[PDB]
Amino acid sequence: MGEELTLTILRQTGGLGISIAGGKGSTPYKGDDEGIFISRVSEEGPAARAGVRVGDKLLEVNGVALQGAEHHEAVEALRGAGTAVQMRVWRER
Amino acid sequence: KPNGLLITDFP
Question: Which whole-number Å values give the CA distances from A52 to A49, A60, A62, in the listed order?
Fold first, then answer.
């Protein structure tokens, strides 16, 4: 069980303040799940302020779907994401 | 090709 949330990261002057992990065909971050996950959130950064949490599974970035994605596809999505990053996540309870 | 646990940081 869990919930889906869409968080909006408002970038400031210190970067997004997250790390992402996982992806199809590489070592799973969590169990045998090959999804993209949030593996780090900087405490003082804008992702923390928006409400993103470690362990959130990343479903979309600015509406671009990442279900079944390889790691580099999520990296590319975040690189292109701009000043306000809308991040749809699944948060296991 | 990167292998293992892939983690990419956006500081």
Answer: 8, 13, 15
| Sequence-ordered list of residues with C-beta below 8 angstroms from that of A4, at least 6 positions apart, any chain | A59, A88, A89, A90, A91
Query: Which method, experimentally, gave rise to this model?
Result: X-ray
How far off is chain A from B1, nearest CA to CA, in Å?
10
Please provide the DSSP assignment of A43-75 as one string. Answer: TTSHHHHHT--TT-EEEEETTEE-TT--HHHHH
* Distance from C-alpha of B9 to C-alpha of A90, rounded to nearest angstrom: 20
Rg (CA), chain B: 8
Classify residue A74 by burial, with Cβ atoms within 10 Å: 0-12, 13-18, 19+: buried
Residues of chain B found within 8 Å of residue A40, distances taken between Cβ atoms: 7, 9
Q: How far is A4 from chain B (nearest CA, A)?
A: 23
Q: Any idea which residue has 């994605």 for tokens?
A: A69
